[PDB]
Structure formats: structure tokens, C-alpha cells
């Protein structure tokens, strides 16, 4: 709730919107709007990393009490992170959910939006910080330390039969005067079975970043159509239930339509140009039905391709055979779908949905929205987001990271669109440059298993694959690629790694972790899994991202680290 | 004039005639009226057009425009001169005489 706490929000603030994300911008531009509405000046921020965050707060060494960060938080007992915080108001709203408890407790400078059907970690603080063994926060028999310290009367207090609290059992000795430590460790470790179940085996994401924010601003009587679209963007990023889960899809078909359909501000007069209120339809995650012909865009998506195996010829043969049953002309299969004639381009999906039921594909259609600004053309559900990811354009000017962020947030207006087509173009060329490596690497047989996983390494830098989003995308097209056709049915289920050269950064051999096949809810080990070898030998590793599934190494200090990381 | 379909009149009657008066976005640029008039001023006697505005307007003309363009693209001319000669009037007194024009695609 903040139908009460929002009424705190008038004084000065800082609105930080942590490292690059589509949840980020969609969730934050609305609040920029909200906050120049009630006549507040504030601060939006680019985040380059947790160090970027810490210097940022360092540069804002004031007493801005209404500090705000969003889509982060699980890093420390962040009073340890952020010492000078005294009673300063922070707000966490992150869906990176497996977060510390010291950030949850200490009801001082934090917002426990603790609301979940998992009441599983209640004494998770009641024994690690509250108990201790072989400790110094205590007294001694001598008269020089005759003062009572922060006596928790627990293992946090002494273990020499000095514990006024801890009134479950005997006092002097259970079997010995220090069986205190024995039972302390019993509970400690027997329930580190569940502490190590947290944060040291697996990570995930939770819920939205900004649909809660839509309901917040909905209670103040705003029917901002565009805010529905921006939140739609925020979700349709990791609506990708194979990437990171939505789940609620068939429940949000009630939720969001109920937000928007039932309140019909015009039921009879809406046949107008500007922003004719949003609609909903059941369509695909075929990449880019609209502005391209079929036959290139039927070819660069993984799911349409992997099930029909087109990077070899034979897939094209069966492809043509299904265009045959579809009876699309090849010319028409090479003019833009919109550039087609009428009747075919109307009936296209109408036929494809039902007579693809019978030929190896079942999971291409979705439920989404689309709308006009005017009479130019009818933009698409995600063709923003696949234009966005192409704006992470790590050029060597050193300004372009933050500048491309600022550009991106200045994109989803109804105004700036000469760039949006730019994003489309950039996206397409990268999208088929993805495919351009798979044939090279598959049929060169670069699929290094090397034991319990599959593994890739690469050799030099591409501007595609300088940054790691494209890298995860590489790994997540090859994987299906190889494991369709080179295997029996036994070994299709193992995880994957991939090197990522950075000729820019003096030689670091970046990596990204990614998971085996077809287990949507059973997600990453790699919330910590890499860190094993970090303990065993341990060499210059990083975990800088609030994204977990990533590292950054030296050019060449990986292989032995990998041999340790065999297990 | 067999007013059932493919008629000489329906297009010119209002449709093409009003497409441009109707062609609108705020910023109040987004017509072909301004371009037309300011072209006329300098003896041009033409204007530039797209072919995917009909999708901005409708779903019928284009798959009829491709079929018998030879006629449609002169109905365009007639509609053009009648929709522009009203503006040739500053009042009825300075159309010394009308004139013929060429469309583009």
C-alpha cells in the first residue's frame, strides 16, 4: 500500500531506476509524469552498476530523505551497503525477489512489501544474527568487564552459562555447560539446509516492476491509455515464459481487460484518428509479421525454425510444402506482409492458426494488443521492445551507453518515431546476423560438451556480442539448434555456457549462464552456481550485476577455473 | 453512369475529393493542400503522394487502383482541380482561368 504513504511524497527525492531494463523505463517515465504533476522536481538516474549506484549516492551526499530505487535491493544488509542512512526513507519494489532479511527487518529505512504465499523464512534472522557461537559480545568473570552488553541472552550473548533469554530448556548444562553451542549449531546448520536453499542454490524473478504502479496511479483517476501500453511493454519483455516467467497470462486476460474494457469512456464515438483506445487480439511471437516479408522473418526466430530445421536446406523444402498447403506465392512470400495484396494478408493468420495444428508447431500464438496513433500505420505489440534491445549500442564514444538510455526513454512517446523505424532496422540486421553464426558454429562442431554441460567459447569481438544480451541470445538460438539434431533423447537436458570476447576491455572473456530445456518454473542454478569455483580456487571473479547470471573475468583465467568448475 | 460499382462518380463524388481535406494530423501540416497550393504559386502544377495512405484511409481503393489505374489516376486529376480551384478563389475574382495538373506516386 501507499494510498497513505504516497501522501508522504511531497518533499525532495531521488528517483533511481536501476541498471538497464524495460521494466525500468516503463515503470519510471510514468512516475516522472506523476511527479511533475504534483509540482515536484526530482532526479532520474542511469545506473552502470552497483559501483555506479554507490558513487551516485556519493554524489548525492545530502539528506534527500525520500530516496527511491526500483528493481534492485538484494545485495547486502544494505545499511552495511549504505551506512549514512540514518532514518532515510528508501523504497524497494524489486522482482529480483530472493532478497536479504536484514533489508526486510530494521523497519527504519526500507519498505517491506512482503506479500506472498510463502511463509517460509520467519526465523531466518532469529538464529544467524540472533544466535552465535564462540562469540565476544559477552562478559567475563573478572570485574573489569562488569557491564551488560547487548545481551540477546542467546548464542549472540555469552556461551559460558550467561543467557537470561533463551528460556526453552535448562540453564547450567544440557549435557555440558556449552551444549548451548551444540544446539545453536544444530538449528543453525539444520536450517541452513533452508538458508542455503535461499540465495546459494537458485535465483529467479518475481512479479512486475510497474503493474503495481499502474494500480497505484489508477486509484488517483487516470485513464492514461499510453500507460497501459507502457506497462504492457514492461511485461511483454519477460512475458517470455521461456526467458523469465509471466504465468498470469491467462489470468491477466481477466485482469488488464477488466482494467480497460469495463471502463469504456466512449462506447459509440471512438472512430477517430488520435489514440483510439487500445484493443486486444490473439497473435504470435513470430518475429515481425508486419513490415517484412515472410520468408526472412519465418527464418530468424528460433521456435519457428528449430522445430522445422531451416538452417539446412531440407527445412526449406518442407517449408515450401507448407506454404504450398497454405498456397502462399513465393513473390508474396518475399514482399512485405503489408506490401502484399489484400485478401491473402487478411486471411493469413486466419488459416495459419488452424492448419499449423497438424504440422509440428503448437506454441506460436499469444494474446496481446496494438493500436494507431493515426493514419501512418498500425504499430505492433513488441516491435518496440525488439527495437529497444537494438539501442544498447556500445559504441566507443563512452557517452553512448547513458545516451542510448536517455534516447530510449525519450522513444516511447508518441512523438519521437523517426528513430523507432531506425530501431526496427538495426534490430533486423542483428536478428539475421544471429542466424549468420549458427550454421558456422554448428557444422564446424563447436559444441564443446566438456562434461556435465554444453559449453561455447568464441574468439573475437562483434558489436553484436560486445554486450551480453546478444550473447544470451546467441546461446539461446544455438542451443535449440544443436540439441534438436545432434543427440538421442537422453542428453537434451543439460545447461549451457558461452564465452563472450571483449577486445574493447583489454581481455576479459565475458561469460553468461543459461539453463537446460523446457523447464519454465525450474529455473537457474546460476544464482550462485558459478561461485563454487570462486571459492575453490577463486580468481578475479565479478558479480557486479543485480542480474545474477553473469560474470567478468580475465582473457585467459577461466579454463583451470572451469576445470575446478567442472562440478 | 451505372451507379452500382466501378462508377464514374462515387470516387470523385466525395471520396478522393475529401481525402485531402480530411487528411489530417495536428501540427496542421499533414495535408496535401498546403503542398498543392504552394506548388501552384510557383508554376509547378503537381504534388507528391504515397500509395500506402489508402491503408491509412480505407481497404478497398488500392486493390481497385491497381486494376484500372488509367482511369483512377485521372479522376484524381479532376478531383484535384475542383478541390483546388475553390482555393484558387481568394474570393471568386482571381481564377483568371483554371489549369491542368499532374499527380505523382
Curated annotation (Swiss-Prot), chain B:
Signal peptide: none annotated. It is found in: Nucleus; Cytoplasm, Cytosol. It comes from the Eukaryota. Disulfide bonds: none annotated. Acts as a component of the Mcm2-7 complex (Mcm complex) which is the putative replicative helicase essential for 'once per cell cycle' DNA replication initiation and elongation in eukaryotic cells. Core component of CDC45-MCM-GINS (CMG) helicase, the molecular machine that unwinds template DNA during replication, and around which the replisome is built. Belongs to the MCM family. Component of the Mcm2-7 complex. The complex forms a toroidal hexameric ring with the proposed subunit order Mcm2-Mcm6-Mcm4-Mcm7-Mcm3-Mcm5. This is DNA replication licensing factor Mcm5. The chain holds residues 19 to 123 of 733 of the full protein.
Amino acid at each position: 500500500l501507499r494510498n497513505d504513504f504516497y501522501r508522504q511524497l511531497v518533499g525532495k527525492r531521488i528517483l533511481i531506476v536501476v541498471n538497464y531494463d524495460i521494466d525500468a523505463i516503463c515503470a519510471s517515465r510514468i512516475l516522472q509524469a506523476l511527479f511533475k504533476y504534483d509540482h515536484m522536481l526530482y532526479t532520474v538516474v542511469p545506473i552502470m552498476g552497483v559501483t555506479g549506484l554507490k558513487r551516485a549516492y556519493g554524489e548525492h551526499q545530502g539528506d534527500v530523505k525520500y530516496v527511491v530505487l526500483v528493481n534492485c535491493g538484494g545485495c547486502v544488509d544494505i545499511v552495511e551497503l549504505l551506512q549514512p542512512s540514518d532514518d532515510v526513507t528508501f523504497f524497494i519494489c524489486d522482482s529480483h525477489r530472493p532478497l536479504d532479511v536484514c533489508n526486510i527487518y530494521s523497519d527504519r529505512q526500507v519498505c517491506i512489501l512482503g506479500d506472498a504465499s510463502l511463509e517460509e523464512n520467519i526465523p531466518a534472522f532469529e538464529t544467524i544474527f540472533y544466535d552465535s557461537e564462540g562469540e565476544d559480545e559477552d562478559e567475563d568473570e573478572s570485574s573489569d568487564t562488569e557491564q551488560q552488553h547487548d545481551d540477546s541472552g542467546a548464542g549472540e550473548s555469552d556461551q559460558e552459562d550467561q543467557a537470561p533469554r533463551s528460556r526453552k530448556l535448562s540453564r547450567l548444562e544440557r549435557h555440558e555447560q556449552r551444549i548451548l553451542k551444540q544446539r545453536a549449531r544444530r538449528q543453525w546448520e539444520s536450517e541452513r539446509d533452508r538458508i542455503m536453499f535461499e540465495y546459494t542454490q537458485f535465483s529467479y524473478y518475481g512479479r512486475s516492476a510497474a503493474l503495481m504502479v499502474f494500480e497505484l496511479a489508477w486509484k488517483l483517476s487516470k485513464d492514461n491509455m499510453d500507460l497501459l501500453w507502457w506497462a504492457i511493454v514492461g511485461i511483454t519483455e519477460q512475458l517470455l515464459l521461456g526467458k523469465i516467467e509471466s504465468g498470469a497470462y491467462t489470468l491477466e486476460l481477466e485482469q488488464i481487460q477488466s482494467h480497460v474494457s469495463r471502463l469504456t469512456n466512449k462506447t459509440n464515438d471512438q472512430n477517430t484518428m488520435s489514440a483510439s483506445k487500445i484493443t486486444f487480439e490473439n497473435d504470435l511471437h513470430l518475429v515481425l509479421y508486419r513490415h517484412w516479408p515472410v520468408t526472412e522473418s519465418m527464418r530468424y526466430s528460433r521456435y519457428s525454425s528449430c522445430q522445422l530445421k531451416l538452417w539446412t536446406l531440407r527445412g526449406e523444402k518442407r517449408l515450401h510444402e507448407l506454404l504450398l498447403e497454405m498456397g502462399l506465392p513465393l513473390v508474396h512470400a518475399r514482399q512485405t506482409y503489408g506490401a502484399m495484396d489484400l485478401v491473402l494478408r487478411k486471411e493469413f493468420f486466419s488459416m495459419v492458426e488452424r492448419l499449423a495444428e497438424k504440422y509440428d508447431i503448437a506454441d506460436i500464438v499469444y494474446g496481446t494488443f496494438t493500436l494507431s496513433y493515426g493514419y501512418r500505420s498500425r504499430y505492433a505489440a513488441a516491435d518496440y521492445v525488439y527495437a529497444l534491445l537494438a539501442i544498447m549500442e556500445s559504441v566507443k564514444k563512452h557517452k553512448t551507453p547513458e545516451d542510448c538510455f536517455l534516447e530510449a526513454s525519450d522513444a516511447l512517446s508518441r512523438q519521437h518515431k523517426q528513430l523507432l523505424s531506425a530501431g526496427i532496422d538495426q534490430a533486423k540486421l542483428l536478428h539475421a546476423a544471429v542466424f549468420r553464426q549458427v550454421q558456422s558454429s554448428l557444422e564446424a562442431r563447436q559444441v564443446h560438451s566438456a562434461g556435465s554441460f554444453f559449453y561455447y567459447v568464441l574468439q573475437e569481438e562483434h558489436a553484436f556480442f560486445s554486450y551480453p544480451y546478444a550473447l544470451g541470445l546467441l546461446a539461446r538460438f544455438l542451443l535449440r539448434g544443436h540439441v534438436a539434431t545432434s543427440r538421442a533423447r537422453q542428453a537434451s537436458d543439460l545447461p549451457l555456457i558461452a564465452s563472450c570476447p571483449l577486445n574493447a576491455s583489454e581481455g576479459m572473456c565475458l561469460l553468461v549462464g543459461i539453463v537446460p530445456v523446457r523447464e519454465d518454473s525450474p529455473r537457474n542454478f546460476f544464482g550462485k552456481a558459478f561461485e563454487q569455483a570462486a571459492q575453490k580456487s577463486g580468481v578475479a571473479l565479478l558479480q557486479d550485476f543485480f542480474e545474477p547470471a553473469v560474470v567478468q573475468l580475465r582473457q585467459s583465467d577461466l579454463t583451470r577455473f572451469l576445470d575446478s568448475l567442472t562440478v | 453512369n451505372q451507379q452500382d460499382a466501378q462508377i464514374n462518380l462515387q470516387a470523385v463524388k466525395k471520396k478522393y475529393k475529401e481525402f485531402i481535406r480530411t487528411f489530417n494530423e495536428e501540427n496542421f501540416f499533414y495535408k496535401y493542400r498546403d503542398t498543392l497550393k504552394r506548388n501552384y504559386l510557383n508554376g509547378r502544377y503537381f504534388l507528391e503522394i504515397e500509395m500506402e495512405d489508402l491503408v491509412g484511409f480505407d481497404e478497398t481503393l488500392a486493390d481497385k487502383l491497381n486494376k484500372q489505374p488509367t482511369e483512377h489516376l485521372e479522376i484524381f486529376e479532376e478531383a484535384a482541380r475542383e478541390v483546388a480551384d475553390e482555393i484558387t478563389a481568394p474570393r471568386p475574382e482571381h481564377e483568371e482561368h483554371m489549369h491542368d495538373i499532374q499527380i505523382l506516386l
